[PDB]
Amino acid sequence: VTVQDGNFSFSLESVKKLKDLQEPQEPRVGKLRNFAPIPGEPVVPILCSNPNFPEELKPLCKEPNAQEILQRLEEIAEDPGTCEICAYAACTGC
Numbered sequence: 152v153t154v155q156d157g158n159f160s161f162s163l164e165s166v167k168k169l170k171d172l173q174e175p176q177e178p179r180v181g182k183l184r185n186f187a188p189i190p191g192e193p194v195v196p197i198l199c200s201n202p203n204f205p206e207e208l209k210p211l212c213k214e215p216n217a218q219e220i221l222q223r224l225e226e227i228a229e230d231p232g233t234c235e236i237c238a239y240a241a242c243t244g245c
Contacts, residue, residue, distance in 0.1 A: 154227045154234050155243045156211065156220055165205030167228030169221075172201045187229030193218035 153160040164177065167187040194200035199212040211220045227234060227241070237245030 152235065152237070152242045152244045154224065154241055156223065159207065159210060160243050161205055161208050161211070161224065163224070163228040163231075165201075165203075166208070166224040169201050169204050169228070170225065172203055176203065185229055185231075187225060189229075190222035190225035192225070193221055195221065 153162045154166075155161060163184045164180070165172070167184045168177070170188055170192055195212045195217045198209065199206075204212070205224075208220075208224070211217045211224075214220070232241065233239040234242035236242075
């Protein structure tokens with residue numbers, strides 16, 4: 152079950168730790184992805200600000216809407232919402 156902002160499934164781990172990432176890829180964590188800070192840091196250099204961000208979102212960083220998507224991802228990363236309950240197409244794999 153991941154958050155999908157289009158035809159690509161994007162997880163909330165790398166995005167949540169996107170603002171503060173300092174370690175190799177981290178699989179599932181016993182902690183809940185709800186401690187993420189507040190969205191509001193639109194950053195997208197040539198590819199992506201975080202040299203190890205949700206690479207699966209590479210396309211998002213190469214798209215002009217990344218500025219609006221990045222923030223959104225950060226919010227959902229700090230809160231499941233309907234995605235976790237498949238209440239909408241926000242989460243795929245349900």
